[PDB]
Scaffold this active site. Structure first.
Site, PDB file in Angstrom:
ATOM      1  N   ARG A 285      39.873  47.477  49.827  1.00 27.51           N
ATOM      2  CA  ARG A 285      39.965  47.784  48.412  1.00 27.51           C
ATOM      3  C   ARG A 285      38.649  48.381  47.971  1.00 27.51           C
ATOM      4  O   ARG A 285      37.592  47.796  48.191  1.00 27.51           O
ATOM      5  CB  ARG A 285      40.276  46.519  47.609  1.00 27.51           C
ATOM      6  CG  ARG A 285      41.635  45.912  47.951  1.00 27.51           C
ATOM      7  CD  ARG A 285      41.930  44.658  47.164  1.00 27.51           C
ATOM      8  NE  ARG A 285      43.194  44.070  47.598  1.00 27.51           N
ATOM      9  CZ  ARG A 285      43.894  43.189  46.895  1.00 27.51           C
ATOM     10  NH1 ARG A 285      43.458  42.788  45.707  1.00 27.51           N
ATOM     11  NH2 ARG A 285      45.031  42.708  47.381  1.00 27.51           N
TER      12      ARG A 285
ATOM     13  N   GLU B  33      36.649  48.477  45.435  1.00 27.87           N
ATOM     14  CA  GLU B  33      36.276  47.866  44.166  1.00 27.87           C
ATOM     15  C   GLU B  33      35.146  48.732  43.598  1.00 27.87           C
ATOM     16  O   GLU B  33      34.272  49.170  44.336  1.00 27.87           O
ATOM     17  CB  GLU B  33      35.809  46.415  44.374  1.00 27.87           C
ATOM     18  CG  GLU B  33      36.748  45.501  45.214  1.00 27.87           C
ATOM     19  CD  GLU B  33      37.965  44.957  44.444  1.00 27.87           C
ATOM     20  OE1 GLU B  33      38.027  45.095  43.206  1.00 27.87           O
ATOM     21  OE2 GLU B  33      38.872  44.382  45.085  1.00 27.87           O
TER      22      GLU B  33
ATOM     23  N   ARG C 164      31.916  37.677  44.591  1.00 30.26           N
ATOM     24  CA  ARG C 164      33.224  37.182  45.023  1.00 30.26           C
ATOM     25  C   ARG C 164      34.113  38.252  45.663  1.00 30.26           C
ATOM     26  O   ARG C 164      35.243  37.960  46.053  1.00 30.26           O
ATOM     27  CB  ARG C 164      33.963  36.590  43.813  1.00 30.26           C
ATOM     28  CG  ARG C 164      33.279  35.378  43.211  1.00 30.26           C
ATOM     29  CD  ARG C 164      33.438  35.310  41.679  1.00 30.26           C
ATOM     30  NE  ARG C 164      34.436  36.251  41.175  1.00 30.26           N
ATOM     31  CZ  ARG C 164      34.171  37.250  40.338  1.00 30.26           C
ATOM     32  NH1 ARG C 164      32.933  37.446  39.892  1.00 30.26           N
ATOM     33  NH2 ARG C 164      35.150  38.052  39.935  1.00 30.26           N
ATOM     34  N   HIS C 165      33.631  39.491  45.733  1.00 28.96           N
ATOM     35  CA  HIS C 165      34.455  40.608  46.205  1.00 28.96           C
ATOM     36  C   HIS C 165      33.764  41.357  47.348  1.00 28.96           C
ATOM     37  O   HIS C 165      32.535  41.469  47.375  1.00 28.96           O
ATOM     38  CB  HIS C 165      34.709  41.611  45.075  1.00 28.96           C
ATOM     39  CG  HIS C 165      35.645  41.124  44.016  1.00 28.96           C
ATOM     40  ND1 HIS C 165      35.220  40.388  42.930  1.00 28.96           N
ATOM     41  CD2 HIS C 165      36.980  41.295  43.858  1.00 28.96           C
ATOM     42  CE1 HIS C 165      36.258  40.107  42.159  1.00 28.96           C
ATOM     43  NE2 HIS C 165      37.337  40.653  42.695  1.00 28.96           N
TER      44      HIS C 165
ATOM     45  N   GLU D 280      39.447  31.957  42.419  1.00 28.48           N
ATOM     46  CA  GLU D 280      40.738  32.176  43.048  1.00 28.48           C
ATOM     47  C   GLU D 280      40.603  32.393  44.553  1.00 28.48           C
ATOM     48  O   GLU D 280      39.848  33.262  44.990  1.00 28.48           O
ATOM     49  CB  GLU D 280      41.398  33.399  42.441  1.00 28.48           C
ATOM     50  CG  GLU D 280      42.679  33.774  43.153  1.00 28.48           C
ATOM     51  CD  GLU D 280      43.138  35.136  42.754  1.00 28.48           C
ATOM     52  OE1 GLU D 280      43.905  35.763  43.509  1.00 28.48           O
ATOM     53  OE2 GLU D 280      42.704  35.578  41.675  1.00 28.48           O
TER      54      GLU D 280
ATOM     55  N   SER E 253      46.764  34.050  45.640  1.00 25.85           N
ATOM     56  CA  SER E 253      47.829  34.239  44.682  1.00 25.85           C
ATOM     57  C   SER E 253      49.129  34.358  45.478  1.00 25.85           C
ATOM     58  O   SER E 253      49.126  34.797  46.632  1.00 25.85           O
ATOM     59  CB  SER E 253      47.598  35.497  43.835  1.00 25.85           C
ATOM     60  OG  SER E 253      47.714  36.645  44.646  1.00 25.85           O
TER      61      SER E 253
ATOM     62  N   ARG F  57      37.133  34.307  50.748  1.00 24.95           N
ATOM     63  CA  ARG F  57      37.189  33.426  49.584  1.00 24.95           C
ATOM     64  C   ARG F  57      37.348  31.969  49.989  1.00 24.95           C
ATOM     65  O   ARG F  57      36.685  31.102  49.439  1.00 24.95           O
ATOM     66  CB  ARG F  57      38.337  33.834  48.670  1.00 24.95           C
ATOM     67  CG  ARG F  57      38.078  35.118  47.919  1.00 24.95           C
ATOM     68  CD  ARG F  57      37.365  34.885  46.590  1.00 24.95           C
ATOM     69  NE  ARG F  57      37.173  36.159  45.907  1.00 24.95           N
ATOM     70  CZ  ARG F  57      37.998  36.683  45.005  1.00 24.95           C
ATOM     71  NH1 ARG F  57      39.084  36.029  44.604  1.00 24.95           N
ATOM     72  NH2 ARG F  57      37.711  37.868  44.473  1.00 24.95           N
TER      73      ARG F  57
HETATM   74  N1  LIG Z   1      37.936  42.650  47.053  1.00 25.73           N
HETATM   75  C1  LIG Z   1      38.216  41.390  47.677  1.00 25.73           C
HETATM   76  N2  LIG Z   1      37.297  40.785  48.437  1.00 25.73           N
HETATM   77  C2  LIG Z   1      37.604  39.501  49.081  1.00 25.73           C
HETATM   78  N3  LIG Z   1      38.840  38.903  48.895  1.00 25.73           N
HETATM   79  C3  LIG Z   1      39.759  39.521  48.109  1.00 25.73           C
HETATM   80  C4  LIG Z   1      39.478  40.795  47.470  1.00 25.73           C
HETATM   81  N4  LIG Z   1      40.554  41.175  46.766  1.00 25.73           N
HETATM   82  C5  LIG Z   1      41.541  40.180  46.932  1.00 25.73           C
HETATM   83  N5  LIG Z   1      41.031  39.196  47.775  1.00 25.73           N
HETATM   84  C6  LIG Z   1      41.698  37.958  47.986  1.00 25.73           C
HETATM   85  O1  LIG Z   1      43.068  38.153  48.532  1.00 25.73           O
HETATM   86  C7  LIG Z   1      43.892  37.275  47.670  1.00 25.73           C
HETATM   87  C8  LIG Z   1      45.193  37.816  47.184  1.00 25.73           C
HETATM   88  O2  LIG Z   1      45.059  39.123  46.723  1.00 25.73           O
HETATM   89  P1  LIG Z   1      45.105  39.409  45.186  1.00 25.73           P
HETATM   90  O3  LIG Z   1      45.672  40.783  44.955  1.00 25.73           O
HETATM   91  O4  LIG Z   1      45.918  38.317  44.449  1.00 25.73           O
HETATM   92  O5  LIG Z   1      43.598  39.359  44.716  1.00 25.73           O
HETATM   93  P2  LIG Z   1      43.028  39.482  43.254  1.00 25.73           P
HETATM   94  O6  LIG Z   1      43.970  38.840  42.209  1.00 25.73           O
HETATM   95  O7  LIG Z   1      42.893  40.935  42.874  1.00 25.73           O
HETATM   96  O8  LIG Z   1      41.652  38.716  43.267  1.00 25.73           O
HETATM   97  P3  LIG Z   1      40.529  38.850  42.193  1.00 25.73           P
HETATM   98  O9  LIG Z   1      41.057  38.525  40.777  1.00 25.73           O
HETATM   99  O10 LIG Z   1      39.411  37.897  42.528  1.00 25.73           O
HETATM  100  O11 LIG Z   1      39.935  40.290  42.168  1.00 25.73           O
HETATM  101  C9  LIG Z   1      42.984  36.621  46.673  1.00 25.73           C
HETATM  102  O12 LIG Z   1      43.410  35.491  46.016  1.00 25.73           O
HETATM  103  C10 LIG Z   1      41.706  36.567  47.397  1.00 25.73           C
HETATM  104  O13 LIG Z   1      41.359  35.441  48.096  1.00 25.73           O
HETATM  105 MG   LIG Z   2      45.418  37.183  42.537  1.00 23.66          MG
HETATM  106 MG   LIG Z   3      43.124  37.464  40.488  1.00 25.14          MG
HETATM  107 MG   LIG Z   4      41.153  42.206  42.187  1.00 22.04          MG
END
Ligand SMILES: Nc1ncnc2c1ncn2[C@@H]1O[C@H](COP(=O)(O)OP(=O)(O)OP(=O)(O)O)[C@@H](O)[C@H]1O
Ligand SMILES: [Mg+2]
Ligand SMILES: [Mg+2]
Ligand SMILES: [Mg+2]
Ligand SMILES: Nc1ncnc2c1ncn2[C@@H]1O[C@H](COP(=O)(O)OC(=O)[C@@H](N)CC(=O)O)[C@@H](O)[C@H]1O
Lengths: 438, 438
Positions: A214, A216, A222-223, A361, A364, A412
């Site tokens: 991703r 970002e 956290r990312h 988180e 999900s 995470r």
């Molecule tokens: N950029 C990232 N870096 C590390 N882990 C990630 C990242 N994006 C998502 N994850 C993770 O994969 C999971 C499921 O993906 P999801 O699409 O629900 O993430 P997310 O809701 O976008 O998370 P966040 O709100 O922290 O950005 C998360 O709960 C998490 O542990």
């Molecule tokens: Mg999520």
């Molecule tokens: Mg989220």
């Molecule tokens: Mg996200």
């Protein structure tokens, strides 16, 4: 092999036997009539003791020439003795220098002179020579194994889905575009559509542990732009609580494996990892907003809870329930993806959930909408074109069971488990807004 | 859940007890005084027997309305009887229709009407409903598990390394360039540079099972552009034979696991999987060229052994030494990457090897050149720029033990293990020169 035993593998039964040990020079002490050489391996340090009257003279004169971080191998006799820090020493018969280290080291492996995270990531091979860093990556490996073992014991089959794709997505953001010969493609951000498609295959119970990508746009603690996602999808469920129950047992299994198998590493990290207490608490989204409101944190009903809100709720659940782990669920349907099933009886809320670990988180998931026509309408409600998801919708037309699943971030999970401040601590070579190397 | 037992999980023990089964409608017999319903799940067929005298009249009426591939769930009583071809039948109390299937189906799950590979790949959720296809993907999951278990039993720690990188890991051809924000980057062809860097960390024994990406120009039955590589690197070795010994043990373990745990799938595939015989034969590149020349296949020394040469050698080894698996080793240094150690006393050949399975390469590896200055010169000999590898070379300057390893293709291994004609049969969503979707 240049060694027969790691430092941790030498026990009393080996007393007086010959072994070979090998590693990096940790310390040399030339104390006149006796000299000491300490060698560090993955598991700790081993004491080499050289009394003048008990070793070859060339050995005796070699020891002082050894330098910090030289790679050496030693063959000698195990001697258990109270005089030895760690219960035993090795009386050397042969010492071989395998490879000599250069002499301003990039990082201080004693930890005395501490370095910035950037410097540490730039020199990860040195960083891991520190026990507290090695401990994290041993634990990472343990978490991966525990998770897979739990899936296997529960009848899940491992699957592997593509990372180079050209599918539509709900959000159309954070994509890494790439040329694929003549065509345009992207790196996958989640195996979501693929694992759902396979729910129509009979596989029924699948998991995948694989990188996700991703882009970002800004860094956080956290990312990462590259992460490892633990994905599962399971068919023939009656509701999302069956997925939540599975997920909490999975996470508890990972936690307990680390507690049982990595006590040494936990000790090194000066960390007490709590015994999980099952059913984790469930907190409805309604209740979470009420709690946040009373803390002066505003989130309008219908909107997702933000990072600040999670932090506040994590604190609240620890203070009020002594719960490091808890579920947020019964989200507004408008806040969650088109593929989540609504409560048929109260459609303004949906069967999605988030698992929170120390206020962040880690996962999900939810029960999906498996009924094609309703699914199609939900894509429309999101303001999206169902035609763009044809390849996926097609799998819902030929016998698709009810199903649900989750995505659990490995980084995470580990970062939160160990209460570490930065996610960069739990992956060897982070990728973020400005970090592309090493 | 809508089911309690898969078809394969119902034994004598459960006679007369209530269970829940679920799956896809396979056949219905609509007779005046009795209905028979057969449902298919991941493991096979289950017979549901509904005499008019015995069942709810509403259930009697429902069964004839069911259609092929409808998803249903049945609660009922297990009844063992010689009259049921599978040994038992379910006497149903309740049947729920979970989802209905459209006609026509994208593929014929009865197997009667054959479909082309491209059609099958376009509809994998249908393709896996056939036992011979499901069998492959069950075996795939078993192979991954076996490999990981063997690594763990042998003290290897799992690692995870970047798939977005600034420097090609295997060289200029067959590479996917990709922008990383402002920077030029590439997808990883392998984790080669990272697994070596970690040999300077003390980890010593690492493995990684992860996607690799190669932009192959040609389309063949044995290449993909996305694949899963089983990589390992191990330190403190004395020669490449130690690595080959570990690899053959790993592969033998995977094969024996499939033999022991997947006999039913092997049966479905009408396939006899041979018991491995260790050690596999070791054939030097020189000797391989002698064998081929004796067969009239002339390869000038230094040149690669082509696919024809591989096929001929495979057949020879199968004939002469009853060996479906064998190693080629002591290759020309010029034919192998800069990271392989040359034979110091005979530099035209190097410490590299390939493992061949039924005449097709499934792994390559070797002892690496861990000596910094020699390594740099080898990068130069390949016409590359050492400065492009600074983050990698850095790891060789502060105490680097001798090391070696291999990359084992998961698709290659599974394809060859089951003697399958096309590598696309062993990965769910293949990526090749012409295939980017689904
Ligand atoms: N950029 C990232 N870096 C590390 N882990 C990630 C990242 N994006 C998502 N994850 C993770 O994969 C999971 C499921 O993906 P999801 O699409 O629900 O993430 P997310 O809701 O976008 O998370 P966040 O709100 O922290 O950005 C998360 O709960 C998490 O542990
Ligand atoms: Mg999520
Ligand atoms: Mg989220
Ligand atoms: Mg996200
Ligand atoms: N295009 C492809 N499609 C399907 N499978 C492929 C494809 N390309 C490679 N593989 C597989 O990975 C193994 C190692 O790759 P190599 O390029 O030989 O060596 C390397 O990549 C080294 N770093 C390994 C090592 O020295 O450790 C193969 O034997 C094979 O099964």
């Amino acid at each position: 092999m240049y060694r027969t035993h790691y430092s941790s593998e030498i026990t009393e039964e080996l007393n007086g036997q010959k072994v070979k040990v090998a590693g990096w020079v940790w310390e040399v002490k030339d104390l006149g009539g006796i000299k000491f050489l300490w060698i560090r391996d993955r598991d700790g340090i081993v004491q080499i003791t050289a009394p003048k009257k008990k070793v070859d003279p060339e050995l005796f004169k070699l020891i002082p020439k050894l330098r910090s971080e030289d790679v050496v191998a030693v063959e000698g006799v195990v001697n258990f003795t109270p005089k030895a820090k760690l219960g035993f020493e090795i009386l050397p018969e042969k010492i071989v220098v395998l490879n000599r280290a250069e002499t301003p080291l990039p990082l201080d492996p004693t930890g005395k002179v501490k370095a910035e995270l950037d410097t540490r990531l730039d020199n990860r091979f040195m960083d891991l020579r520190r026990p507290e860093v090695m401990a994290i990556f041993k634990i990472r490996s343990s978490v991966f194994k525990a998770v897979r073992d739990f899936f296997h014991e529960n009848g899940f089959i491992e699957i592997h889905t593509p990372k180079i794709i050209a599918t539509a997505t709900e959000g159309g953001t954070e994509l890494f575009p790439m040329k694929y010969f003549e065509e345009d493609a992207f790196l996958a951000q989640s195996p979501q559509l693929y694992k759902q498609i396979m729910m129509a295959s009979g596989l029924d119970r699948v998991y995948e542990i694989a990188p996700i990508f991703r882009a970002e746009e800004h860094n956080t603690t956290r990312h990462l732009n590259e992460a490892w996602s633990i994905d599962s999808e399971m068919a023939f469920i009656e509701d999302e609580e069956e997925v939540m129950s599975f997920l909490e047992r999975l996470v508890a299994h990972a936690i307990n494996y680390v507690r049982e198998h990595n006590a040494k590493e936990l000790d090194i990290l000066n960390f007490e990892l709590e015994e999980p207490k099952l059913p984790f608490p469930r907190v409805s989204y309604d209740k979470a907003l009420e709690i946040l409101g009373d803390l002066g944190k505003e989130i309008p009903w219908g909107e997702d809870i933000d990072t600040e809100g999670e932090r506040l709720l994590g604190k609240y659940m620890m203070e009020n329930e002594n719960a490091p782990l808890y579920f947020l669920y019964q989200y507004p349907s408008e806040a969650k993806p088109f593929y989540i099933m609504k409560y048929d009886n109260k459609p303004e809320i949906c069967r999605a959930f988030d698992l929170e670990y120390r206020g962040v988180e880690i996962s999900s998931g939810g029960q999906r909408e498996h009924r094609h026509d309703i699914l199609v309408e939900q894509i429309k409600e999101k303001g999206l074109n169902p035609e763009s998801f044809e390849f996926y919708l097609k799998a819902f037309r030929y016998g698709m069971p009810p199903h649900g699943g989750f995505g659990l971030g490995a980084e995470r999970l580990i970062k939160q488990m160990l209460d570490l401040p930065n996610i960069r601590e739990v992956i060897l070579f982070p990728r973020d807004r400005r970090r592309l190397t090493p």
